[PDB]
């Protein structure tokens, strides 16, 4: 079948791309970055998420895999060391799929429509902003502050988790909202944890411009009037050779290795 | 059909109890505090929370239904002056149930099994204490600190807010643990959000005697060898009359009624 | 003497100040807004901050007051209703001088220097920065994240309490850094009190651009090669006529006025 | 000059002991643990914490000094490699003076007085607890949680520190107030630094027991009355023979040594 590889760029990168393509060689398996059923990432994390939005319109026709050459990553969890193993396996296994939960968000002005690995934020241009918070129709507050965070499942370890975020398994088709240093002279302040089909919605008050994030991509858009988030119906689907449990990652990256 | 109805014991509390009581009376409802399909709390959310526990062995077959007396609770979310439109309703009406997930916990000796509609906690007797957190038969960490919170969906808005827990909506099948104090010179420090199947055990390393609550009740446990959790099997059924959404519920609570 | 009255420039402020005016036209009390021995300042604590430093060269000849039209501030803390009396005892009243700390801030590139009256911070050119921490000479900790907030014990109430800082009162000569949505996976995380000689020192890693603010002014700094802190020399000097208590103040603004 | 020595009683700690004493011996040094001008203490920081208890009332005559045979100590801050240095400069040594500032605990019932070197709290018999709080006999917040926390500017790398309260330098003569599990629904929340006269005061509202600690001491109070905290005018004093900074000791310990 057809697959791909992307690379961080070093050397330890480059090199270890270059042996599996080689040992793809030596079964059927044609390259193809245009029509992968399978995509393989190497390096860390953040090369994983690269690979992820390169191929966001083909999602449910893919099959994603991480490699780290560097530290132990949350995607990227595959040693280079096994590599080799990988490629027996991808070429006659019959391997078994993990899923996640995306994230959904949605802009309009006075349509464009984005999809998360870890999460969208949003925040001013400059100095504190405020926004209405609407969930399902209905008013629920009204935020000043830094910004705001809305992370899917495998995302709440990464900026989720800086802001107080709860770590939350990603076999839960959920999306959690945290605050961005909230003046309280009114919020929540607690993080908020939403399931399948509410929809929380983001108002501008006085200022129309924001810093509107999606993972690594950030953009700055004016006369923006409504920011809408949900649990997405699409999901990321990874290829399973092994057990690695999200618990046991949790505990390698945070804990000790 | 039978029904029961308990009061916080005050004035107020024992009138409105006495006036629903006379209008049951208007109706085919016999009262019966043996056998209830229909549980009723007057007073407020600590007055159902005893409601619940004295009824925990039929909850398949009954239906509970809270009235706040004094200030809006999360379950007794019916003001007193819908009463009588409860009696009618409750009486000939095919309303709908509302069903919340509920907290397993189970204690081993040298067992014992409970249902907590908002939390188990695990505390020392006296002082910091220590124990090791296994996540589904993998050591997670060793906790040294206060205590530990095992926390329900519906649970969320109490004891684990307070911790820096993060509010999730009672929809969703989980359940949350968070920290008491630890001392960190390892623990992840991250409420930690589990799903329907994954067990959480806690294990003593040096002192095997603890105070370990459920709910209201606090009982000094002795020679404890494992304190497992787990989202129960059973659930918490509500009688659904009109649309008062959770969220509006923290709203009310906690921002402003 | 010589005073002036800056105002928030909206109608009830305005006129609050032309009828100040009138009843210092009542006195011996020559207006001057070049070399006045009294700032009244007239709206909220936005108004007295940008008095502050429309004055910050001759701060050791000015006594400061702040007048609230709008909510109580912490240091716009008198109400309108009394600007007759202060009138009449600026004019031949002995009144004392409260004094608090400051915030000296030190930018090298590759030196300018500023006051706070309440924090400085520090920020990235967009997504999170890297920055080492320097203590008196010695490395303290390597920072990733949103950046850092180095505040003076009157500003503890604002930026710094959002990001978990503690409330200090002004009588304590010393500054406190807090961070902003630090990445640890390595930071003390907990908020830090410098006395008044030590020196703390931010310096970049990589990127060399910063977003460095002082109060409600914010300039991109570039090609920064050290942002030095430490509590100011100079302080601020406010016309005492009644006792008002900073905790007192603490408590009308956060818990209930 | 007169010396003892407490040991935290294991063969390490013992034959640390037995070696310094015999050095001692070497030299016009009469060992007395009942008028010793100078207490070595020899384990961790507890064991320190212990010997500044036993001598509490001869704190004005005494220079502490602590060696930790195990994990660095903010107050056993000495090597055993340097036991032998220690009893050279002790003997015929000039050595400086440290101070760091103690905490005044006060109950009264319908007087009784302690001294703390690093931390007090107060918690309830059960339960959640509620007491007022009053700052400088004005009423400040009534709390409802798990207890509270007032700390010396060296406890607050302990407990405090794990109640997110901020790290003092303790050259500051001050106090820090934390919560534990405040319930929300009015506290500060905020950690609260208050300065050398300031006097806090804990009431109790319905019940008038409570488990009161001071450092490692712990007396379940009965029919409590009022419980008064205040920076206290006596002050622990060290031997300093090098320099080893606060900043340093926080570093090594939470950062990486
Ligand atoms: N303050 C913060 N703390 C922790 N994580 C943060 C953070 N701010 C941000 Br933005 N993040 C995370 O940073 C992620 C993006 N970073 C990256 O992709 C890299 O930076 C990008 C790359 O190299 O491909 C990954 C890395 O450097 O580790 C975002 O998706 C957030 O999850
Ligand atoms: N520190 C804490 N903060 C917030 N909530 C807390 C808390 N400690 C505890 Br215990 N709780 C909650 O207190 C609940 C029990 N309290 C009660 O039932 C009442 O106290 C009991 C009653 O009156 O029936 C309810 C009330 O007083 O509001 C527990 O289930 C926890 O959820
Ligand atoms: N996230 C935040 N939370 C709380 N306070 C914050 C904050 N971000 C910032 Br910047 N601040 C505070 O905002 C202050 C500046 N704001 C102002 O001066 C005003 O905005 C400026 C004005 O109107 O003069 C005051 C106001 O609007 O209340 C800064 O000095 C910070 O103390
Ligand atoms: N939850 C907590 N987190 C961090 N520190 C805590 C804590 N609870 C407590 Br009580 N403490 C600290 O524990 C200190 C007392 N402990 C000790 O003295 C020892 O336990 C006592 C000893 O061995 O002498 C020291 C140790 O074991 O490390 C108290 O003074 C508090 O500062
Ligand atoms: N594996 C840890 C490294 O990868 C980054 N990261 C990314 Br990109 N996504 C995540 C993620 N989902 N969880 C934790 N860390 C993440 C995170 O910023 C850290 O630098
Ligand atoms: N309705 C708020 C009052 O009820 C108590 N409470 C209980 Br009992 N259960 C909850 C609960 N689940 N959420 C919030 N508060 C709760 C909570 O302690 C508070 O005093
Ligand atoms: N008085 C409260 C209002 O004034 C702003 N503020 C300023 Br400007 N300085 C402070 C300050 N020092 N403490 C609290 N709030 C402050 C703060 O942002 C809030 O909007
Ligand atoms: N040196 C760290 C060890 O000593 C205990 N400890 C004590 Br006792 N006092 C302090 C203290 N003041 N700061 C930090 N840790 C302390 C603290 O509980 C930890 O176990």
Redesign the interface.
């Given at each position: 079948m057809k697959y791909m590889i992307t690379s961080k760029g070093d050397e330890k990168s480059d090199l270890l791309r270059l042996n599996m393509i080689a040992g793809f060689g030596e079964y059927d398996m044609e390259y193809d970055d245009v029509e992968p059923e399978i995509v393989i990432s190497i390096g860390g994390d953040g090369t994983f998420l690269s690979a992820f939005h390169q191929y966001e319109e083909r999602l449910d026709e893919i099959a994603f895999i991480g490699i780290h050459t560097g530290h132990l990553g949350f995607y990227a969890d595959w040693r280079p060391a096994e590599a080799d193993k990988l490629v027996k396996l991808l070429a006659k296994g019959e391997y078994q799929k993990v899923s996640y939960p995306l994230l959904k968000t949605t802009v309009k002005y006075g349509e464009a429509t984005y999809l998360a690995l870890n999460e969208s934020t949003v925040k001013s241009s400059?100095?504190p902003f405020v926004v209405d918070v609407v969930?399902?129709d209905?008013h629920?507050?009204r935020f000043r502050?830094?910004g705001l965070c809305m992370s899917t499942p495998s995302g709440t370890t990464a900026?989720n988790?800086?802001?107080?975020?709860?770590?939350?398994?990603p076999?839960?088709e959920?999306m959690?909202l945290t605050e961005?240093?909230?003046?309280?002279?009114?919020?929540?302040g607690?993080?908020?944890?939403?399931?399948k089909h509410?929809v929380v919605s983001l108002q501008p008050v006085n200022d129309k411009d924001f810093q509107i994030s999606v993972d690594h991509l950030?953009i700055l858009h004016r006369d923006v009037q409504e920011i809408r988030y949900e649990v997405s119906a699409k999901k990321i689907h990874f290829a399973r050779f092994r057990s690695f449990?999200f618990?046991?990652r949790?505990?390698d990256?945070?804990?000790?290795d």
């Open positions: 400059g100095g969930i399902n209905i629920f507050e502050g830094d900026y988790k800086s802001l107080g975020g709860a770590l939350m398994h076999s839960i959920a959690q961005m240093a909230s003046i309280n002279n009114r919020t929540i607690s993080p908020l944890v939403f399931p509410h950030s449990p618990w046991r949790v505990h990256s945070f804990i000790e």
